[PDB]
Amino acid sequence: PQITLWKRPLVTIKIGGQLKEALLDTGADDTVIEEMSLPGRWKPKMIGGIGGFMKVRQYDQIIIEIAGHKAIGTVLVGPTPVNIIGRNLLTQIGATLNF
Amino acid sequence: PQITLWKRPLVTIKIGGQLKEALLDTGADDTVIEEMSLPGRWKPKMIGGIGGFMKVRQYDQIIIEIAGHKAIGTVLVGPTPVNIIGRNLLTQIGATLNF
Ligand SMILES: COc1ccc(S(=O)(=O)N(CC(C)C)C[C@@H](O)[C@H](Cc2ccccc2)NC(=O)O[C@H]2CO[C@H]3O[C@@H]4OCC[C@@H]4[C@H]32)cc1
Ligand SMILES: [Cl-]
Ligand SMILES: [Cl-]
Ligand SMILES: [Cl-]
Ligand SMILES: [Cl-]
Numbered sequence: 628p629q630i631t632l633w634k635r636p637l638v639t640i641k642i643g644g645q646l647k648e649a650l651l652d653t654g655a656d657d658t659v660i661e662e663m664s665l666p667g668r669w670k671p672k673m674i675g676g677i678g679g680f681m682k683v684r685q686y687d688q689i690i691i692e693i694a695g696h697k698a699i700g701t702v703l704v705g706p707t708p709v710n711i712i713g714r715n716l717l718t719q720i721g722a723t724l725n726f
Numbered sequence: 727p728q729i730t731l732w733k734r735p736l737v738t739i740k741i742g743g744q745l746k747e748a749l750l751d752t753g754a755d756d757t758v759i760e761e762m763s764l765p766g767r768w769k770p771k772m773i774g775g776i777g778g779f780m781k782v783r784q785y786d787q788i789i790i791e792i793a794g795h796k797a798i799g800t801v802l803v804g805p806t807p808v809n810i811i812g813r814n815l816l817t818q819i820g821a822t823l824n825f
């Protein structure tokens with residue numbers, strides 16, 4: 628698809644068997660999802676943002692569908708105000724910016 | 727152009743007679759620029775994201791040149807860790823997300 632930006636670029640994702648809404652966010656290096664349970668071990672990460680920093684849980688090699696496209700990669704979990712699909716997974720679904 | 731997302735999608739902008747580097751950011755409703763003077767009236771605003779909120783000055787009807795493409799809109803000025811071109815101006819240069 629070709630997604631214009633008059634509204635927020637929200638899509639459905641599927642992660643841990645669950646459907647969620649998320650933003651497709653070219654200004655995000657990484658993918659950040661609201662508190663949820665994921666399998667396996669996690670590693671610490673601090674991320675930056677507008678407002679300051681946030682600690683998250685880093686889970687690697689997580690299966691995630693984004694707008695019907697399959698990705699497998701790193702998901703940061705924490706108390707984010709919005710679920711964000713960052714460049715680590717936007718590249719896996721073949722997304723580009725065009726003008 | 728077509729801009730891939732392997733790296734941050736940074737472009738040169740011209741604002742207030744100054745050249746700056748800025749991130750093309752589909753996850754940002756608003757354009758947010760590091761502290762600078764702009765002409766005309768402003769009003770305070772609070773904007774929110776990964777780490778809470780940041781206070782900014784809202785300037786309306788500001789012309790910008792984004793990678794060669796002129797647009798006009800609202801610009802928020804404050805201590806942003808990164809200069810960000812948000813959807814309010816991305817729409818005006820015809821930017822879309824494609825996959
Ligand atoms: C109303 O209008 C607004 C309101 C909010 C924002 S925002 O900057 O808070 N943001 C909203 C989004 C969280 C829903 C836009 C994002 O694209 C920011 C834009 C952003 C970039 C850098 C710093 C501050 C903000 N990215 C961001 O927070 O990314 C996080 C996740 O990945 C990491 O990559 C980034 O680069 C490393 C740190 C951040 C980390 C912008 C305009
Ligand atoms: Cl980015
Ligand atoms: Cl990844
Ligand atoms: Cl957005
Ligand atoms: Cl505007």
Ligand SMILES: [Cl-]
Nearest residue numbers: 631632817820
């Ligand atoms: Cl359009």
Ligand code: NA
Nearest residue numbers: 766767786787
């Ligand atoms: Na003005």
